[PDB]
Amino acid sequence: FSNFPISEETIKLLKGRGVTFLFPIQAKTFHHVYSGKDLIAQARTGTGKTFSFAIPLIEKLHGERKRGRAPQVLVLAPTRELANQVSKDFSDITKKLSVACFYGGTPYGGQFERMRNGIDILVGTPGRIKDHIQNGKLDLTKLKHVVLDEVDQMLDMGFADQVEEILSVAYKSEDNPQTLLFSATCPHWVFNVAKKYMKSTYEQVDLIKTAITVEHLAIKCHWTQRAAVIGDVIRVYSGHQGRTIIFCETKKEAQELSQNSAIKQDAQSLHGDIPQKQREITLKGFRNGSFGVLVATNVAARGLDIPEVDLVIQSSPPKDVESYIHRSGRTGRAGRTGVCICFYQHKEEYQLVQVEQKAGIKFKRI
Ligand SMILES: [Mg+2]
């Protein structure tokens, strides 16, 4: 987070959660939130998605304690489970601000005490929040930020009407709260909300090829932690009905990685020690969406008819840089920018520099 508008204290708290970086798509959300802009972001459930809004909002508030104070931030989540995770993430990176979590199927007593004592960041489900507005205990007239998290799930559950009622209280045109909308897909209801509640100058973060062509990222990671980071990149960059190829050197690396719990459910391997008939079947299956993650060695990948994919991952810097560039060309479906990730170890640091010289390319070192 060097030259990121985050305090040293916050960076130390993030380290305590094993957060040492934000993926570029998350890093882009940070700047839009930090700059005060209204936003529609496209990302699914993840650790870094919550931090994309939590870190810049917390920094803002820390810069800006009366008993019974009204919240400054409202985060609506569709379930008790999701609300509890968002609240915990805020609470883990701020020891200064009062963080509260309000959901249904629970008594009012504890929630009443939080409101009596004062709240800075309020996380909750629409039903319970609406109830507290109605009973006159919750003040949403002093909000500065509103986050509508997992709008897809929220709408699927039938909350659209209740969310519209809640927003109608906080957005009574000038000096309205900063509005942040998050989802994995962008339904009709998302832009209908933006058209009414959001400023005409609202931003969008979704990976559609906006004069970039192809992203080349570099991740410094010890081999023992690579599988957890690989799952995280797929969750962040690839989506539902997503195509991802992971390239390895050794057949054991590809086999073990495909068998590894991080992606075991969605992954399938392709190496020399697999019969040709099965290698044929498996590639055909990948093409016709039987599974979403193909873990193949760089050897078996030579000459193999690979389709257009969302994300290309390298376990270590590529020795055949020529093949790496060809695969970059065959990345980025449905008008979206292609993501090319290269994992490297401290010992493989110069090995990644060779790729850059040989290809005449610059990796976003994250
Ligand atoms: Mg076919």
Residue numbers in the entry: 188 to 251, 255 to 362, 365 to 558
Q: Can you quote the paper on this entry?
A:
RNA helicase DDX21 plays vital roles in ribosomal RNA biogenesis, transcription, and the regulation of host innate immunity during virus infection. DDX21 is composed of three domains, including the N‐terminal domain, the middle D1 and D2 domain, and the C‐terminal foldase domain. In summary, here we reported multiple sets of crystal structures of RNA helicase DDX21 either in ligand‐free (DDX21‐apo) or in complex with AMP (DDX21‐AMP), ADP (DDX21‐ADP), or a nonhydrolyzable ATP analog (AMPPNP) and a 15‐nucleotide poly(U) ssRNA (DDX21‐AMPPNP‐U15), corresponding to different unwinding states (except for DDX21‐AMP). We elucidated the conformational rearrangements upon the ATP and ssRNA binding during the dsRNA unwinding cycle, and described an RNA unwinding machinery including one wedge helix, one sensor motif V, and the DEVD box.
Therefore, we deleted the linker loop partially (GKKTQ; residue 401‐405) and generated a new construct (named as a del‐loop mutant), which helped us obtain a 1.8 Å resolution crystal structure of DDX21‐ADP and another DDX21‐apo structure with 3.1 Å resolution. Here, we have shown that the DDX21 helicase core adopted an open conformation in its apo‐state, and the success of crystallization either without the linker loop or del‐loop constructs indicated the vast flexibility of the open conformation in solution. When DDX21 was in the apo‐state, the RNA binding pocket was closed tightly. Three motifs in the D1 domain sterically clashed with the modeled ssRNA molecule, including residue Gly295 from motif Ib, residue Asp321 from motif Ic, and more significantly, residues Met347 and Phe349 adjacent to Gln352 which interacted with U4 in the RNA bound structure. A short loop (TGTG, named as “TG loop”) within the motif I had severe steric hindrance with the modeled AMPPNP in DDX21 apo‐structure; thus the ATP‐binding pocket was in the closed conformation. Comparison of the structures of DDX21 involved in the unwinding cycle revealed that the two conserved domains (D1 and D2) of helicase core unambiguously showed an “open” to “closed” conformational change between the apo‐state and post‐unwound state. From the apo‐ to post‐unwound state, D2 domain not only shifted ≈29 Å but also rotated by ≈180°; from the post‐unwound to post‐hydrolysis state, D2 shifted ≈24 Å and rotated by ≈100°; and from the post‐hydrolysis back to the apo‐state, D2 shifted ≈25 Å and rotated by ≈78°. First, the apo‐D1D2 core bound dsRNA in an ATP independent manner.
